[PDB]
Amino acid sequence: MKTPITEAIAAADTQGRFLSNTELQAVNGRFERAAASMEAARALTNNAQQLIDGAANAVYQKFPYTTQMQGANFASDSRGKSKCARDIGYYLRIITYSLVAGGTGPLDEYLIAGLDEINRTFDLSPSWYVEALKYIKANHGLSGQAANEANTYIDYAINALS
Amino acid sequence: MKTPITEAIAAADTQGRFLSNTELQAVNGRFERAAASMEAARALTNNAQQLIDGAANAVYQKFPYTTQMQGANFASDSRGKSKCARDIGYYLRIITYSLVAGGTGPLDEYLIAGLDEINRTFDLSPSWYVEALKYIKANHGLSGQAANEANTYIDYAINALS
Amino acid sequence: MKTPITEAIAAADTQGRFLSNTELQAVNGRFERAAASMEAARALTNNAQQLIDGAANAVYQKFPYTTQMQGANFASDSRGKSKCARDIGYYLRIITYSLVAGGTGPLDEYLIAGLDEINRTFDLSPSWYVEALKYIKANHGLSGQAANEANTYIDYAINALS
Amino acid sequence: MKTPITEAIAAADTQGRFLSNTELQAVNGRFERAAASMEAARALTNNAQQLIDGAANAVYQKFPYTTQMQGANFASDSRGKSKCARDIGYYLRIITYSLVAGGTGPLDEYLIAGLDEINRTFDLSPSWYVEALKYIKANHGLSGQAANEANTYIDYAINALS
Amino acid sequence: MLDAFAKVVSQADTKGEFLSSAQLDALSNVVKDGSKRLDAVNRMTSNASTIVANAARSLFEEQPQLIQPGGNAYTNRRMAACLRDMEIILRYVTYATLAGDSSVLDDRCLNGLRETYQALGVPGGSVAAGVAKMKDAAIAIVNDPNGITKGDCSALVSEIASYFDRAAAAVA
Amino acid sequence: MLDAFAKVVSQADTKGEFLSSAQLDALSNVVKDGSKRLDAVNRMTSNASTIVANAARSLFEEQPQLIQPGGNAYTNRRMAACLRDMEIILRYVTYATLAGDSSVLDDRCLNGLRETYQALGVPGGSVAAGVAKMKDAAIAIVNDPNGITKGDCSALVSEIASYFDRAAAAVA
Amino acid sequence: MLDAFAKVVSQADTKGEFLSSAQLDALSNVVKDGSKRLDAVNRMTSNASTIVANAARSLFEEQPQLIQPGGNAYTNRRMAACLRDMEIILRYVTYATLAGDSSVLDDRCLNGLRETYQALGVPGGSVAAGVAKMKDAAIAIVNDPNGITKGDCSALVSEIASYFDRAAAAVA
Amino acid sequence: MLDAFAKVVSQADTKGEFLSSAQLDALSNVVKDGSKRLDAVNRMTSNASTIVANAARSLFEEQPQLIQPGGNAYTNRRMAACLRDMEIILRYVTYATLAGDSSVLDDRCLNGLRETYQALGVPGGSVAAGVAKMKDAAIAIVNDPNGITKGDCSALVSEIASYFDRAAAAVA
Ligand SMILES: *[C@@H](C)[C@H]1/C(=C/c2[nH]c(/C=C3N=C(/C=C4\NC(=O)C(CC)=C4C)C(C)=C\3CCC(=O)O)c(CCC(=O)O)c2C)NC(=O)[C@@H]1C
Ligand SMILES: *[C@@H](C)[C@H]1/C(=C/c2[nH]c(/C=C3N=C(/C=C4\NC(=O)C(CC)=C4C)C(C)=C\3CCC(=O)O)c(CCC(=O)O)c2C)NC(=O)[C@@H]1C
Ligand SMILES: *[C@H](C)[C@H]1/C(=C/c2[nH]c(/C=C3N=C(/C=C4\NC(=O)C(CC)=C4C)C(C)=C\3CCC(=O)O)c(CCC(=O)O)c2C)NC(=O)[C@@H]1C
Ligand SMILES: *[C@H](C)[C@H]1/C(=C/c2[nH]c(/C=C3N=C(/C=C4\NC(=O)C(CC)=C4C)C(C)=C\3CCC(=O)O)c(CCC(=O)O)c2C)NC(=O)[C@@H]1C
Ligand SMILES: *[C@H](C)[C@H]1/C(=C/c2[nH]c(/C=C3N=C(/C=C4\NC(=O)C(CC)=C4C)C(C)=C\3CCC(=O)O)c(CCC(=O)O)c2C)NC(=O)[C@@H]1C
Ligand SMILES: *[C@H](C)[C@H]1/C(=C/c2[nH]c(/C=C3N=C(/C=C4\NC(=O)C(CC)=C4C)C(C)=C\3CCC(=O)O)c(CCC(=O)O)c2C)NC(=O)[C@@H]1C
Ligand SMILES: *[C@H](C)[C@H]1/C(=C/c2[nH]c(/C=C3N=C(/C=C4\NC(=O)C(CC)=C4C)C(C)=C\3CCC(=O)O)c(CCC(=O)O)c2C)NC(=O)[C@@H]1C
Ligand SMILES: *[C@H](C)[C@H]1/C(=C/c2[nH]c(/C=C3N=C(/C=C4\NC(=O)C(CC)=C4C)C(C)=C\3CCC(=O)O)c(CCC(=O)O)c2C)NC(=O)[C@@H]1C
Ligand SMILES: *[C@H](C)[C@H]1/C(=C/c2[nH]c(/C=C3N=C(/C=C4\NC(=O)C(CC)=C4C)C(C)=C\3CCC(=O)O)c(CCC(=O)O)c2C)NC(=O)[C@@H]1C
Ligand SMILES: *[C@H](C)[C@H]1/C(=C/c2[nH]c(/C=C3N=C(/C=C4\NC(=O)C(CC)=C4C)C(C)=C\3CCC(=O)O)c(CCC(=O)O)c2C)NC(=O)[C@@H]1C
Numbered sequence A, B, C, D: 001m002k003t004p005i006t007e008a009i010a011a012a013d014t015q016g017r018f019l020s021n022t023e024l025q026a027v028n029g030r031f032e033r034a035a036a037s038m039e040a041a042r043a044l045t046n047n048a049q050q051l052i053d054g055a056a057n058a059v060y061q062k063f064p065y066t067t068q069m070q071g072a073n074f075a076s077d078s079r080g081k082s083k084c085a086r087d088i089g090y091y092l093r094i095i096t097y098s099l100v101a102g103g104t105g106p107l108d109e110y111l112i113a114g115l116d117e118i119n120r121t122f123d124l125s126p127s128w129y130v131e132a133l134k135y136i137k138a139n140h141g142l143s144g145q146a147a148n149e150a151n152t153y154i155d156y157a158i159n160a161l162s
Numbered sequence E, F, G, H: 001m002l003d004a005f006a007k008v009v010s011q012a013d014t015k016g017e018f019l020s021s022a023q024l025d026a027l028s029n030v031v032k033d034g035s036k037r038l039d040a041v042n043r044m045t046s047n048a049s050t051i052v053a054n055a056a057r058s059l060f061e062e063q064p065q066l067i068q069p070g071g072n073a074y075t076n077r078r079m080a081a082c083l084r085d086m087e088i089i090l091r092y093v094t095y096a097t098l099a100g101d102s103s104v105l106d107d108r109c110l111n112g113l114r115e116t117y118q119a120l121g122v123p124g125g126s127v128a129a130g131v132a133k134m135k136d137a138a139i140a141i142v143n144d145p146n147g148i149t150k151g152d153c154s155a156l157v158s159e160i161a162s163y164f165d166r167a168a169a170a171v172a
């Protein structure tokens, strides 16, 4: 899959040559960032349940009709609320995938591809998930560069919905 | 000019997009190494005269005929010795260019291109300049990553001669 | 293989015609030169051992570090000196091949092809072999056109190293 | 003009290189034969009038009707006999051109091109000129390689008529 | 294109000289501010929509005829084109910011842009005003002290403002 | 191809679960050995000629008929191709060393190499011998404590040795 | 293709040795017969029509049904193709005579000639007959002592005869 | 292109005349000096690097600004280009020397070269000086009495010098 390391190796192999100092400079930039990336991925994975439930509740408070109107696509009953939390879990899960991989690869392949027609078919508003990702971004309890790494990929998923 | 920064910007521009997270990761890898690269460039520029004169004398001791035999391609007189020190100054100067830029660009453009034609025409043995570079590499006085940076670009100029 | 005679025959056959007076003029030029070429090839083959050993010794005297420094690529010990003489023998052997063939064919096919990466991989300086060929050229004991034929192909190998 | 020398120079120029050893071998083959070629050209030019008049008379004896029958394409009067001697002079002149140049170039350009159209239009039997050339070949008085050179270019003009 | 290092090296190669201690100090300053440079570029990028929006809003309040019938920014086609141009100029500004040299912005964006606007009927002065409001919005986003290690970014900020002013002058 | 992180991510996506603490720990360990991984790749790359030369030398000392008339490595044409093969295998081992995963080495170099080698009549056992000689020469260069910060690289060296053993076993 | 010298050089390169005195002597002998070799080629070339005519004449005297209605050489189309075949074989024999080696004759003319001749239904035995007639006519022309320096050409003539026998045996 | 023989033959064909005894004598002189001509061409060729080097050195001592910063021969790119031009002119001089006629040098090298230099900013006078120093170096190498049968080459040497002077005048 497309990661900064496999990208550098692919460029070197295409020209049938060893990795250059510039490619080794780029891989070092990834290995430096990877510490913050791993801390963010560890935090989001550990606090998955609290972040998921808080994100769903933030969407319900923001768009109250999602818990009031009937219809299978809404979250008025227990089945809908559980589907919502499952969805938000899917988003956060693939976000940690990307934090581990050091690139958007997993988000592009596992989440964004076909996401627009899934949401369109089942009448799921993208602004719901944008709000859930906004909550996770403001409640992951990270600081410094680990917060910046998390925010980079959370914003990447937000922009894919907009 | 080709530098790691201009390469990343050119990649983003050809796709008409802002710089991605992976491109910024690569630029960070260059900025991280740039402190050690700038250290090497400063040490080589301050000790330029001492390193140049030492490299020339290293060549004269390794290839004794270059100070003995008559001939315009040899350093058996004052004129030849000035030309030899000048050439070594050219090599080291362009090596500091590459350390400053963060890539082999200046070495490729300002030194290596046409170098084999110059050496062949004027009967300058490339082994002479390999030996001068080997002395500068063994006696620049640097340590740690500043030495590693200086070594990679001196080794690059050595390989261009082989 | 590419010899002046097979070159003339190939040009005639490509146009499906007998050899012209001009092609027969060129082949005569080869047959005239072939007497000096054969004398040179006979001399270098007979005095192979003395020429090889003298060439190796001329390289050792010219570049004294080749017999002083340790390292498998140098000739400090008996194994290195024997490898050096074997190499110089390879050069002279293929040079006599070219003198017999009346063209650079054997030198291009048996020696120069891949020579640059062989020397680069095993850290063998081309200027060593240039000096050995310079000795053989100055000590083959030929005169007139046989000396010129020998010098033509010795200089051809020298230029392939430069 | 196409000569062995201009052919070799054109070959070197199209590859943007100096002349090779094989090209110089070919040019030597032309210079070696040029002494005999120049001998033939001198003998044919000095004995031009005697060879021309003898060749014409050889044709009149071999094809007796050419001096008997009326007709403008025949040599039964003074005008026709002058035209016939002139034509044979043309053939021999251009043959000396080719001997001087060292190749069939002048014969190809100055004589053979259009020759069949000229002979057909004016009803000049090519067998007449084959016979005149056969006389000049049998009676030029040359020996050795000068005769061989003259013969090859006279035979070339004969073959162009057949 | 040139960055700050390649520009200095190209001037030194023409003079045939080693880098002076002045040039070595200047580039060491650029290298020590490299992390701030990344923060600046990443903040302008992550907030490109906000920077364009704040700029367009202030431009349309100042020149309301742009968004009224017959305005050069009226209709969906001209509005989308206008926003695309603002994002384009910002994109090239972030190039020059990461590079430390305006060469990429001058060559691949500003060169001949004035003539392009005068041919299309686009108000160059209005574009220059919009670019200036992009500058103020981008600087405010870059200089936001929240969620970032405190420090002086004033030299960088002056550099970024110079790239914006360069962009504005090429169309005014 | 996959690096160390993409392999774990791809297996967790197949299972549809978050990554466990054991997987996070293993990948965090790879990250903490990042500078050591770069040193190994940089040392194996800049000494690639020395590595191939040392392995070729020892192979030709043990099987001297390879550089004797009739040998599969005799003549300029076959010796240069032998050295080219050595460089290629070492190049792909450095790819795997950087990636932390042998996927690139197996897919693009080792797959079908024995079948081709058998077709060209190249002694696959001698190639596997020279590959094992590269391992010794490459690991000695990697493990050189000169001019480098002292530390334990045994896990990295064992990983690199496994890549060389994979290449050797693919042609043996 | 190979000439006399390339064949010896290629075999010595396979053995990896210098050329012996016996090989140097044999190739020096070829060089001393160089002017004689050129005479043979020049005489076989400039008399190529006479050679083909003499061989064809004697072949059609011995096998008169070839130029009789129904014959494989009757009609203008087949007679011209027969003469063209004669010229081609003689042309390649002169190639071999100049090269001092039959490699060009075997590779580019004789290889697969019997199979084609059998396909087109051309009597291969009659072709081999005419080829042997060319040999007699060509050798008589080569051996003509008129207008040439007297000397022994028996080795050269025997070599040329061997080339004609190779062609004859390739279709017989 | 024309050589000495083709030039004489082309003039005679236009006049429609046999060659005079003057022209036949002149060409017999060229043929008798053919071996010296080959020696001259082969000596200039084998020593092309030395001839260029000696010429460039003397030119750069005479005009030191060429190899100083801002000089037209400074930097690796302009130096390699300058040396390439010197070798080019020498190459075409050796063509005219073997041919005995300057037609190839005039047509395929000198024609329009002046205009090419004035467009590229190359000092035509400096090139003409360099070509003159090539002449002196080549003549010295051609007239070297060591390792060659003694004899008078003065006519040839005058011819070669005329080709060099021709080359110099086309750019001065
Ligand atoms: C000026 C814009 C503001 C400012 C910047 C600032 N940051 C630091 C600290 C850091 N900034 C980074 C940025 C990155 N490294 C990367 O690889 C990437 C892209 C993937 C980015 C965006 C980093 C790594 C650091 C160090 C860790 C930390 O958080 O401290 C400083 C002080 C340290 C320094 O100068 O290097 C400053 C000044 N601070 C302000 O107050 C300005 C508004
Ligand atoms: C003028 C440049 C110098 C000079 C020349 C010179 N040489 C001879 C002798 C010979 N030169 C050759 C040259 C060649 N024949 C070839 O086929 C080739 C290329 C493959 C070359 C280069 C030959 C064959 C000879 C004859 C053998 C011999 O060595 O004598 C002479 C005198 C004989 C003659 O003119 O033909 C001269 C004058 N000598 C000088 O002193 C000038 C400096
Ligand atoms: C939560 C923010 C809001 C919400 C959620 C909701 N979702 C459904 C059903 C589905 N959600 C998905 C999404 C995905 N499936 C995948 O494989 C991936 C890739 C990781 C994604 C993003 C899909 C496909 C469905 C339909 C099929 C299924 O049930 O799995 C419902 C029920 C809708 C229905 O018609 O069944 C709900 C309620 N709705 C709200 O009101 C919340 C605010
Ligand atoms: C010193 C190691 C040995 C040595 C040096 C030497 N050089 C010359 C002349 C030249 N050196 C160059 C090299 C360059 N010029 C460039 O622009 C560049 C790229 C930056 C390079 C690498 C060139 C072009 C020349 C010739 C032109 C000139 O003078 O500048 C000499 C004199 C040679 C002569 O024939 O004039 C010498 C002696 N020789 C030794 O023996 C030293 C060991
Ligand atoms: C002698 C001038 C210097 C010298 C010689 C030396 N060579 C080696 C090893 C090798 N030489 C070759 C060259 C060839 N092999 C071929 O098939 C051909 C084509 C004809 C050539 C030109 C090669 C391939 C090797 C390495 C493999 C082998 O041993 O056969 C050594 C030992 C180096 C080593 O690492 O084993 C030496 C010492 N070194 C000097 O110092 C002399 C001045
Ligand atoms: C002499 C062997 C027999 C002969 C000759 C004859 N020729 C003519 C007229 C012409 N001859 C030519 C030939 C050439 N003109 C060229 O430029 C060239 C190339 C160098 C050649 C070969 C031409 C063109 C003519 C016609 C134009 C002219 O007069 O020049 C005649 C008179 C024919 C007429 O109709 O006027 C004759 C008699 N005829 C014999 O019987 C001789 C045996
Ligand atoms: C917005 C603040 C102002 C404005 C802009 C506007 N532009 C167009 C059309 C074009 N804009 C460009 C600019 C670029 N394209 C590039 O590729 C680059 C460099 C990377 C630049 C700088 C171009 C080329 C055009 C041509 C047509 C197009 O749409 O691409 C319009 C529409 C014009 C029309 O009549 O349709 C507008 C409105 N208009 C305003 O009022 C603002 C002041
Ligand atoms: C040297 C260690 C041994 C040896 C090697 C040898 N190989 C050939 C020919 C080939 N080797 C390859 C291998 C690759 N090409 C690639 O692109 C890749 C990576 C995807 C690999 C692994 C191939 C394809 C060939 C055939 C095509 C070619 O030659 O380039 C030779 C020459 C064989 C010959 O000339 O007939 C040799 C000598 N032989 C030994 O004896 C050493 C043990
Ligand atoms: C194991 C192979 C040997 C070893 C390695 C080692 N290195 C460190 C520290 C560092 N290694 C590097 C190397 C690079 N960074 C890059 O960006 C690049 C390519 C452009 C390279 C080649 C760096 C920068 C460091 C940090 C600074 C330093 O010099 O220490 C350690 C210490 C622990 C750590 O991981 O940092 C070790 C162990 N040392 C040995 O003894 C092993 C033989
Ligand atoms: C004449 C001695 C005998 C004879 C010959 C004959 N051949 C054909 C047809 C062909 N001959 C060839 C031979 C070659 N073509 C080449 O290029 C080469 C060298 C590489 C050779 C040796 C070929 C290819 C053909 C078929 C294609 C063609 O005709 O060009 C014929 C005509 C057969 C027909 O018309 O059906 C004849 C007569 N036949 C005899 O009887 C003589 C004994």
Ligand SMILES: *[C@H](C)[C@H]1/C(=C/c2[nH]c(/C=C3N=C(/C=C4\NC(=O)C(CC)=C4C)C(C)=C\3CCC(=O)O)c(CCC(=O)O)c2C)NC(=O)[C@@H]1C
Pocket: C021, C024, C025, C028, D033, D144, D145, G032, G033, G034, G035, G036, G038, G039, G040, G042, G142, G143, G144, G145, G148, G149, G150, G151, G152, G153, G156
């Ligand atoms: C054997 C076929 C007959 C024979 C040949 C013979 N020739 C010589 C001498 C020479 N032959 C040539 C021929 C050429 N040189 C060329 O460049 C060309 C093509 C352009 C040809 C055709 C030459 C120049 C000579 C030297 C001068 C001379 O005429 O003698 C000999 C004598 C020994 C020798 O090899 O020189 C012989 C024997 N003579 C016979 O009787 C055989 C029938």
Ligand SMILES: *[C@H](C)[C@H]1/C(=C/c2[nH]c(/C=C3N=C(/C=C4\NC(=O)C(CC)=C4C)C(C)=C\3CCC(=O)O)c(CCC(=O)O)c2C)NC(=O)[C@@H]1C
Pocket: H066, H071, H072, H073, H077, H078, H079, H081, H082, H083, H085, H086, H088, H108, H109, H113, H116, H120, H122, H123, H126, H127, H130
């Ligand atoms: C060297 C003594 C002087 C000098 C030369 C110089 N030339 C260039 C560029 C060019 N030279 C040529 C000449 C030819 N190319 C051909 O193919 C032929 C005929 C076969 C000729 C005569 C050409 C076409 C060029 C154009 C560009 C190129 O490099 O090919 C330069 C570089 C110019 C630049 O600005 O890069 C130089 C330096 N300069 C001196 O100072 C010497 C006096």
